[PDB]
Amino acid sequence: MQVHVIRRENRALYAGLLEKYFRIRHQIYVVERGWKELDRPDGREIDQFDTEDAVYLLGVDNDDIVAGMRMVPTTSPTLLSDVFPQLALAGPVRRPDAYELSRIFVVPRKRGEHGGPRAEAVIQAAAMEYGLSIGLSAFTIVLETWWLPRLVDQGWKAKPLGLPQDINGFSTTAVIVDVDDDAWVGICNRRSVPGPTLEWRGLEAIRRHSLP
Ligand SMILES: CC(C)(COP(=O)(O)OP(=O)(O)OC[C@H]1O[C@@H](n2cnc3c(N)ncnc32)[C@H](O)[C@@H]1OP(=O)(O)O)[C@@H](O)C(=O)NCCC(=O)NCCS
Numbered sequence: 001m002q003v004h005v006i007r008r009e010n011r012a013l014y015a016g017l018l019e020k021y022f023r024i025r026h027q028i029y030v031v032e033r034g035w036k037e038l039d040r041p042d043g044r045e046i047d048q049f050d051t052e053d054a055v056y057l058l059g060v061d062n063d064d065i066v067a068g069m070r071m072v073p074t075t076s077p078t079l080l081s082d083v084f085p086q087l088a089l090a091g092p093v094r095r096p097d098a099y100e101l102s103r104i105f106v107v108p109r110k111r112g113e114h115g116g117p118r119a120e121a122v123i124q125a126a127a128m129e130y131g132l133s134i135g136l137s138a139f140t141i142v143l144e145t146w147w148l149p150r151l152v153d154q155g156w157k158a159k160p161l162g163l164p165q166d167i168n169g170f171s172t173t174a175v176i177v178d179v180d181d182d183a184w185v186g187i188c189n190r191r192s193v194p195g196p197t198l199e200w201r202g203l204e205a206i207r208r209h210s211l212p
């Protein structure tokens with residue numbers, strides 16, 4: 001899988017893939033998960049946090065989107081700040097060095113064991129790769145509570161920001177995850193991800209830091 005960084009500065013280069021992306025999200029979230037609340041008239045699954053400040057990581061395999069991740073700066077409106085503030089006791093995280101992760105998916109074809117590293121593992125490793133590249137110290141996540149043992153198992157250190165709550169019938173919690181060398185090297189080692197997978201097409205102006 002090839003993981004493309006898509007952001008404000010190179011969005012123009014990815015118009016076609018982004019069109020396909022918002023459609024895939026309809027299938028994954030509205031159709032498969034049955035999250036009818038996210039349905040929209042034109043059939044795209046796009047919400048209030050799909051803005052120019054968002055960063056997408058899109059995994060592409062044999063011309064198809066097979067995995068995805070959305071990242072929103074915590075200085076911008078987030079799911080935590082604007083939709084689920086009650087999940088963080090002290091208040092929303094609003095830090096220049098923290099991003100909120102959302103809309104993680106792998107298409108059915110790439111779930112579980114196939115070729116080498118699991119797509120699930122590659123997209124999450126790519127998230128940490130991005131964070132380390134731009135010098136983030138944390139990722140926030142509003143997530144279903146079944147993620148918690150998975151985050152432990154892949155080597156991440158996720159601290160809860162509050163108590164779990166039932167949202168839309170299911171237990172949900174907000175966490176803050178450390179972004180550091182161990183977080184990335186950890187998943188890579190535990191999941192057989194061969195280090196860097198990110199593409200930075202048209203992003204030559206953006207400085208990043210050497211990966212460990
Ligand atoms: C979450 C996801 C990336 C996991 O992919 P994967 O780990 O490669 O493969 P699977 O889907 O088989 O999931 C493996 C395990 O994760 C857990 N899991 C995955 N989806 C789950 C759900 N909706 N509810 C509860 N547990 C779930 C289960 O323990 C599952 O094993 P089991 O079904 O044998 O019990 C994938 O299922 C997906 O893309 N789902 C739709 C998007 C989504 O729900 N994302 C979170 C909200 S943004």
Ligand SMILES: Nc1ncnc2c1ncn2[C@@H]1O[C@H](CSCC[C@H](NC(=O)/C=C/C2C=CC(O)C=C2)C(=O)O)[C@@H](O)[C@H]1O
Pocket residue numbers: 035037038047048049079083101102103104124127141142143144147167168172
């Ligand atoms: N705009 C939105 N308004 C209102 N509601 C919304 C909006 N959007 C989504 N909901 C709803 O949020 C609920 C709880 S789930 C919390 C949000 C969820 N993200 C993760 O799980 C991240 C995992 C994750 C990410 C990275 C990882 O590495 C591991 C797990 C998501 O992006 O949909 C669901 O019932 C949705 O219907």
